[PDB]
Amino acid sequence: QKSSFQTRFNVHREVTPVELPNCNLVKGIDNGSEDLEILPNGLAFISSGLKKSGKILLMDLNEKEPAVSELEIIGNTLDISSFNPWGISTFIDDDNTVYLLVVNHPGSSSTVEVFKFQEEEKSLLHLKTIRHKLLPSVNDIVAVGPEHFYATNDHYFIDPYLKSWEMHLGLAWSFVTYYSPNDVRVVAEGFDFANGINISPDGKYVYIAELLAHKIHVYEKHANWTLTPLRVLSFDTLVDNISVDPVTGDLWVGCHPNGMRIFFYDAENPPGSEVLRIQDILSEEPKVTVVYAENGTVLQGSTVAAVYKGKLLIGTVFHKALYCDL
Ligand SMILES: [Br-]
Ligand SMILES: [Br-]
Ligand SMILES: [Ca+2]
Ligand SMILES: [Ca+2]
């Protein structure tokens, strides 16, 4: 028991540094940047202020030193006042409309909010609130249409007091749901805190991070939307969000080296950050490289990292964000 805790929360881990030439804190990000996603054109959406307001931020990564702006959410179908965004995902339709899907925790429950991005206006037009009995505790999603996605539930329970028991007992009842207007079903289950999720650029593989098991599961994804287990990779770190580079298919993964520091926050012992790159994920020996790692004297609690034209943007649960030369 105390032993399965020590191993799940990686309570002994310390971080060997892995430095990058020229990293700057992103001015204006001080209360989290837990998930982010960069469009083919170099615009980056970042969710923030996870639990100032909850906000969706925008950076144009083509700029020299991109400044962050807050997107204005418009519409009457959403109460912005309890907006508490977590994972996000984007979907670009055949006419090039950009949809942004955002996991929301307005109180103890979960929804997925769907927005249309209005580029000229720098605004997000709310379209729909999605909720469902198979989306009890949503952590992140990956969109495969305007209202179609796979979602991880990082717990089975909705009530925060039961969630906490569920996590501490190690039930491993976290699960993944495929959501679409006519067909919502469980596609995988039995995880110890499923969390990041993404898809290969050809749509044939789904990747799921299992935070407290320290694993990334690769599933074949089929024409009828079902998933079947294909590979599992293991790590000496808590894997959080997965980003996928569209040119190569590489995974870029934000990680928490030591789970004690990220789960029991202590300002005198803050969590560090760590970013992995994973290549040739189907091969017999996937290539895993630590691209960036530190103990938190600069960036605390890295959750996500993605690359665009030689630059690496790294977000955190509740702290800052870093933009680096690769
Ligand atoms: Br519940
Ligand atoms: Br750490
Ligand atoms: Ca995401
Ligand atoms: Ca997370």
Span from the CA of 127 to the centroid of ligand 4 (angstroms):
25
- Quick one: which ligand is closest to 254's CA? 4
User: For residue 155, which ligand has an atom nearest its CA?
Assistant: 1
Q: Helices (H), strands (E): how many in the chain?
A: 3, 25
**Structural tokens at position 64:** 């020299």
What is the Å distance from ligand 1's center to 203 Cα?
A: 33
For residue 94, the tally of other CB atoms under 10 A from its CB is: 5
- Structure's resolution in angstroms: 2.1
Sheet containing 322-325, strands listed edge to edge, beginning at the edge strand earlier in sequence: 23-25, 322-325, 311-316, 302-308
CA distance 92 to 143: 9
Q: How far apart are the CA of 2 and the centre of ligand 3, in A?
A: 32
The CA 285 to ligand 4 mean position distance, Å, reads 27
DSSP 149-174: EEEEES-S--SHHHHHHHHHTT---E
54 contact partners, CB below 8 Å, separation of at least 6: 47, 48, 83, 84, 85, 104
SS3 of residue 96 by DSSP: coil
Edge-to-edge order in the sheet of strand 273-279? 238-244, 251-256, 273-279, 287-294
Amino acid (1-letter code) at residue 11: V
Tokens standing for 302? 């890295």
- The CA distance from 172 to 167, in Å, is 7
Q: How far is the centre of ligand 1, averaged over its atoms, from the C-alpha of 28 (Å)?
A: 36
How many angstroms is it from 1 CA to the middle of ligand 3?
32
3-class secondary-structure state, position 302: strand
Cα(123) to centroid of ligand 4, in Å?
Answer: 25
Could you tell me the distance, in angstroms and rounded to a whole number, from the CA of residue 209 to the centre of ligand 3? 11
Rounded to the nearest whole angstrom, what is the distance from the C-alpha of residue 193 to the centroid of ligand 4?
A: 10
Neighbours of ion ligand 1 (CB under 5 A): 157-159
Domains by residue range for the chain, with CATH: 1-326 (2.120.10.30)
